[PDB]
């Protein structure tokens, strides 16, 4: 069990991007596996790791990995100390005194982390920094949605609301516009609300909701979305689209799509893993949407037929890949 003592301060009560700074440092340290104690005066408990934070600080680093004793610094600032179990034999009940004694006893180097010291003046800056920490190599497409995430975070909008709203948007394009025969506009509707995923991802990262529920809902609503897309196609071409062979191929892809998702979900239930295959959910989505949009613009429908065939075949080999690897894992685990 790991313990982290952070000293109480006046600025921790301020709210930044939907949480308090107090809540932000607490949740950050919890994700690093520390149980957090806020203290006006330190009372030490028996434990393994001891993390002492004094100055008010916003930690911008995503994964904080603490291995071995060291001093935590960011750009010249000393944000906090990491002491081992030995500090239990030093600390006599006075804070500053016990720290300098332990510093005289042990020579520890300084490890660099991404963090900013809180001041009343630089709050705007911190906010700017925190938003940029959310991108994490995802690229320009992630960055352009940062003002929307900022807006939604300030308004008290939950990431689940964004996810649900995004899914209702996809369903509206797929189950309304497609059966009407509007393939182009249905597709731009689907396309617009598909990026809501990048928004909830930013928010889930910003608002600290990474939990099993969040993951569950994202997986589930993604399934609802993809199924709706094929459903609309199937319906439209069996009726007003007047193309049964395209409708049959679309229906086959729907089923094949479900089977590709269910293999992986079911494997994980068994403790195994099945993240493999040529066909990936977003990639499958993209080619279908592009073709359907094109057909909605007057392109010959055989373009969609070809794409559905290729997608059927790609789904089949993907299923084979997943089923094969879970078999290797299962048979190896029993022996
Ligand atoms: C389309 C206008 C959107 C207005 C949203 C107002 C939200 C304010 C709630 C603050 C709490
Ligand atoms: C037909 C209603 C469309 C607008 C729904 C707005 C829901 C606002 C929820 C605010 C709850 C606090
Ligand atoms: C803290 C999680 C709160 C989740 C709220 C979900 C509300 C969904 C809004 C849908 C509006 C249409
Ligand atoms: C929220 C969006 C989900 C709505 C799906 C159920 C609505 C069904 C309406 C279907 C209209 C199809 C009209 C075809 C005309 C030919
Ligand atoms: C006469 C065709 C009207 C089609 C309008 C579709 C509106 C869908 C709105 C979903 C919410
Ligand atoms: C909420 C769940 C919505 C799913 C409803 C799917 C609606 C199916 C649309 C059927 C309309 C077919 C148009 C027939 C014209 C002849
Ligand atoms: C690569 C799959 C084979 C494509 C055959 C589709 C023929 C479409 C003719 C209409
Ligand atoms: Mg998703």
Residue numbers in the entry: -130 to 204
Paper's wording?
We determined the structure of a chimeric construct of PIP synthase from R. salmoninarum (RsPIPS)—the causative agent for bacterial kidney disease in salmonids, a major threat to these species worldwide17—in which the first six residues of the RsPIPS sequence were omitted (RsPIPS-Δ6N). Crystals of RsPIPS-Δ6N diffracted X-rays to 2.5 Å resolution, and the structure was solved by molecular replacement using the cytidylyltransferase-like domain of Af2299 as a search model. The crystals of RsPIPS-Δ6N diffracted well in the apo-state (2.5 Å), but attempts to obtain co-crystal structures with CDP-DAG were unsuccessful. In RsPIPS, the central polar cavity is located at the cytosolic boundary of the membrane, and contains three distinct regions, which together form the active site. Proximal to the nucleotide-binding site, and within the membrane-spanning region is a pocket wedged between TMs 4, 5 and 6, which probably represents the inositol phosphate acceptor-binding cavity. Several conserved residues line this cavity, including two arginine residues (R153 and R191) that in the structure of RsPIPS-Δ6N coordinate a ion present at high concentration in the crystallization solution. We hypothesize that these residues coordinate the phosphate of inositol phosphate, a moiety unique to PIP synthases. Directly above the nucleotide-binding site, we observed a gap between JM1 and TM2, creating a hydrophobic groove that is open to the membrane. We hypothesize that this diminished activity of MtPIPS-Δ6N is due to compromised binding of CDP-DAG, as JM1 is truncated and distorted in RsPIPS-Δ6N, potentially interfering with CDP-DAG binding. This could provide an explanation as to why we were unable to obtain the structure of RsPIPS-Δ6N in complex with its cognate lipid substrate.
In the initial step, phosphatidylinositol-phosphate (PIP) synthases generate PIP using L-myo-inositol-1-phosphate (inositol phosphate) as the acceptor alcohol and CDP-DAG as the donor substrate; subsequently, the terminal phosphate is removed by an as-yet-unidentified phosphatase to yield PI4. All (class I) CDP-APs are integral membrane enzymes that catalyse the transfer of a substituted phosphate group from a CDP-linked donor, CDP-DAG for PI and PIP biosynthesis, to an acceptor alcohol to generate a phosphodiester-linked product. We have determined the crystal structures of PIP synthase from Renibacterium salmoninarum, in the apo form and with bound CDP-DAG to 2.5 and 3.6 Å resolution, respectively. RsPIPS adopts a homodimeric architecture similar to those previously observed in Af2299 and AfDIPP synthase, with each protomer possessing six TM helices surrounding a large polar cavity.
